[PDB]
Amino acid sequence: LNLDPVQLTFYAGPNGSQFGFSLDFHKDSHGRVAIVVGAPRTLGPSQEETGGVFLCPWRAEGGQCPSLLFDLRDETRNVGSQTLQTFKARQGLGASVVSWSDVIVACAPWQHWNVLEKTEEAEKTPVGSCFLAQPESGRRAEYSPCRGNTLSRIYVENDFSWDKRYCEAGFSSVVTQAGELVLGAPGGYYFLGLLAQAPVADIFSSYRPGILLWHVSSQSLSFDSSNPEYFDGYWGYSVAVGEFDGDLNTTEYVVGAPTWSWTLGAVEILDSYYQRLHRLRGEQMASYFGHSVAVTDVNGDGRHDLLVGAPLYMESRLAEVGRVYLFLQPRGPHALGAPSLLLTGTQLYGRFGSAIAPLGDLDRDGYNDIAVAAPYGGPSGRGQVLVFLGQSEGLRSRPSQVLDSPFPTGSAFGFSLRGAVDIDDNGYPDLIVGAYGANQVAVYRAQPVVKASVQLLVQDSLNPAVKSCVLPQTKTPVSCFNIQMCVGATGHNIPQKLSLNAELQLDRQKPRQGRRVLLLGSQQAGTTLNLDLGGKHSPICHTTMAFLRDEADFRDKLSPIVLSLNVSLPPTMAPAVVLHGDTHVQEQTRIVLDC
Amino acid sequence: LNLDPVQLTFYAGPNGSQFGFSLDFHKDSHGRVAIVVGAPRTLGPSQEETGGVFLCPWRAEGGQCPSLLFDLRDETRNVGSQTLQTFKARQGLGASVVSWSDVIVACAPWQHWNVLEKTEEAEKTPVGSCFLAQPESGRRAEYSPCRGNTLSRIYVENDFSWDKRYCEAGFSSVVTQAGELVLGAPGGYYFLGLLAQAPVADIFSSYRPGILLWHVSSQSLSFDSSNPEYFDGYWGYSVAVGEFDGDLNTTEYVVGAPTWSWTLGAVEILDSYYQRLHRLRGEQMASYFGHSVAVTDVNGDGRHDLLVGAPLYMESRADRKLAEVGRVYLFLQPRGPHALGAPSLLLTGTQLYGRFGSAIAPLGDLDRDGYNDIAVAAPYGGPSGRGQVLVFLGQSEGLRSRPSQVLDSPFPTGSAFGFSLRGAVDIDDNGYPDLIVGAYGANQVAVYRAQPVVKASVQLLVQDSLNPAVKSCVLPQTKTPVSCFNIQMCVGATGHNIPQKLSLNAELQLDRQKPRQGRRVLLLGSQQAGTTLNLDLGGKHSPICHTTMAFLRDEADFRDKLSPIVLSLNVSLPPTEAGMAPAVVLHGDTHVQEQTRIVLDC
Ligand SMILES: *[C@@H]1O[C@H](CO)[C@@H](O)[C@H](O)[C@H]1NC(C)=O
Ligand SMILES: *[C@@H]1O[C@H](CO)[C@@H](O)[C@H](O)[C@H]1NC(C)=O
Ligand SMILES: [Ca+2]
Ligand SMILES: [Ca+2]
Ligand SMILES: [Ca+2]
Ligand SMILES: [Ca+2]
Ligand SMILES: [Ca+2]
Ligand SMILES: [Ca+2]
Ligand SMILES: [Ca+2]
């Protein structure tokens, strides 16, 4: 709602693009936050297809960020017969970035790995990897469960089972609250999908430079499945962490399979033991249900809620426009299955739902908020971010704000969206929009929100011929009533330069020269006053006095008086304020005399 | 707790005018708050003590104030045979000022009134008169419920039954939320005392300038009692309103009778029909149990609680058998309303002849923690006897038994600092209720502003027990290896209206039990086991935690391997005394200890 569109933070990257495929907020232990962006198609050791990650300090003007190296070299180790080796060709370092407690985990899902066992070989297959690093410490603990030495003949022998040659671990990187790192591998089990879990502390403990194999304590890998629906399931395409079970103190992983059950799609909730507590499938085939998955409690009830993206949805306008499915967390026995809000974009081929970013209390509204992105939406397919507030009792169905791509067509503005981290540390979380091949990363800063609570004090009714008030000049006896207005500013971090303007309307329904009551001071049927609330918490109530003419004067006495007070922000750069809540009170006064 | 004692506002009246005897907060139509101060001995137009009320607008420096021009003039109106007279000489206009909505009720209890019929009369007795005003419109009105025209001999003929000649109505004035003015006349019904309650709108709409004896049609008065206990009860010395019977439609009055049942003292809680719901007897005779009464929900359970004051309570010390200090009783209302019984808390003063409990002011939520705080004033307490005010914070069970803050008189001795108290109103509009204390001896009022309360939080994490020499990260500036680990402490500062310059200080003491310079655990850097560093939180919802590398001495080097390794994290405000007064109050947990041990084979 309060995300500043007119001013944005622009971060540049390599001319080879991909700067913005994935990104996250690196929360420093000191309390600072900086944006870490993976560019999975930067230059290699010698102009090679590789990845790469940049670390941008949080700023406003922006610029060329420094680069954080993880691993770019074709290693080769001779374990007896097996001369195993790694290949950086199109590794994609930066396709998944997640940060936690001074550690950054950035993945290269398409990194290759071949083991030469004399004549036979393991084939140069994309096992993928995800490299961990504490930039302050400098320690690098690369993690790659799918790296192995089992030669291809063994795979071919029995049933091509328990394979990890092309798992592509790290297609989606997330980290729990405790620091446990979770990685997706869509290609695991012969292009079926597996997951990896390992403590970052344990990963750093068990890692040894040079050697290209380990087990790293009790790292938890997903179970291989022979179910036909899982074939080419593409599990671990997108992952997130949130609390969903009946017990606390445990972190669940939500994983998306956009091709589950013959491109139908699914999303699953897993514990650390991978018990599959809940699984919700898609509705439209080839709609890519699960491309991006987000976890946040926008309802404000505390219990986390689920958002699932289907950018390839074909709306029954059969127009290819994505859709975000919302799932509030209920208190039923087997609840959470039925979706509640189905948000759908407008621009054709917009891919509405490629990036769902939790935002938390974006506008100090008391409920969490979200930002969905359609990378090819908008007027001319540029791509647009749709901010949806909590609003309680569900989610804001309408876009509280629409952020337009300032990038040319095809930049896919809005592929990776992250929020839920107050970058301004002002109770107002910000948003970051990165896009694959964008070459630029945009950051939206939220602005203070002012809720208004408005009340009126007007006499309910009176005799038009009371004749108690006295006109100054003419000295005529007239009836009159007490008109007062009190508007107060609620919310957090309200700016002290507030200049709210209140406009009063007496007999609003009646037109001009059809009006009945009329102000003494200004001789007008309505005025605006600077009812500024800046610099104080108490409401301002400056009254007025409008006279009511004699019976014989007018004839609109049969019409009851309408007293509508409407408060609006001043019209006079960036407003830095968003009026919300009650802003128009129309308490009424009727005319009562005999009939 | 957070009431600033350094920067005070001083509002002055005329010399010897008793400016500050009673006071209340008047809210202007625009929401601007002003103070109504009674000065019950201000010089009248004819150089005589009559009374007066000042309307002090809120400022920073303070000073002189304008006064509400009432009608200070004796009145004489002959209604045919009789001759009604009102004498406004030493009437005490300002002895009880209470502001409700846009009206101010300033009562002169000692205004005299006579009815001259031929030779006879009704005796020139003090009936009292409250003066209602609307300073934004000039609408003046008067209310004298106890005025009568019955000749003196009639009461003698009927045993002084329903004798309302000595009411001094306005001795204690309150206004309910529904706009009903309730006056306690301690001297009504021949000093038994009564309550006179009438709607303010009816008071304004039944007053005609010139008529002295009229009758408000909707007013209600108490019942004269033949029970010997009530005699000379002064029933109406102090009066307050609150909810005590269940139904929120009915409003109940709490009325003090400080000399009920032969100076024993009592407080009666009774509904609008003056049916006694409950009676709270005194504890010690001549203690004036009922001198001050306040109603507020200190414990926050949603039910109003009662605060009684006995300024002349003589406590039973071990050394002194009976010493006059004063005592405030706290009664907590439970469910099942007609069960409020034994007192829940018994606060007692310290200074002799300090009159602890002469004023009980509900402060609202001064600390902003969901519980109601009060102020009890001893006008002659304090080591020098010049006057003290004690702030008591509310909690789940009763309220704090010790004064969170103590305010001392800035005025010379005998100023009666604390006689009049009034609070629970944000005067400067900074989100925190303020307090106004009236020292009529010095003819001044002190305004205390509540500075913001910074609620702190501390979380010092030490990962686990460690081995003496793990031979990890080397000792600083040496290739010599030692055992190293991380110390991380997150400190947060949450509060309302906190300034942008807040910067706490974290004292990190490494095994404070051991003497410094040779502690078992030092830092991997400067090696100083005690490091106090500033951590700024000037508008940061995210606690900031600068991790530190810490070194552990050799197993042979440190010989006490059995003593617990206890790290100390202390949070303190910076030395703001160098500049102006401390702008914040760092209430809350600011000091924690975290203990670990020495592990082996790790
Ligand atoms: C989580 O809370 C505490 C702290 O870790 C722990 O002792 C407790 O067993 C946990 N609760 C669960 C697992 O339900
Ligand atoms: C209080 O008064 C309201 C008037 O609207 C009434 O509806 C309600 O029943 C009353 N409650 C009682 C008498 O307990
Ligand atoms: Ca859980
Ligand atoms: Ca929920
Ligand atoms: Ca919000
Ligand atoms: Ca922000
Ligand atoms: Ca009641
Ligand atoms: Ca209570
Ligand atoms: Ca409190």
Ligand SMILES: [Ca+2]
């Ligand atoms: Ca204040």
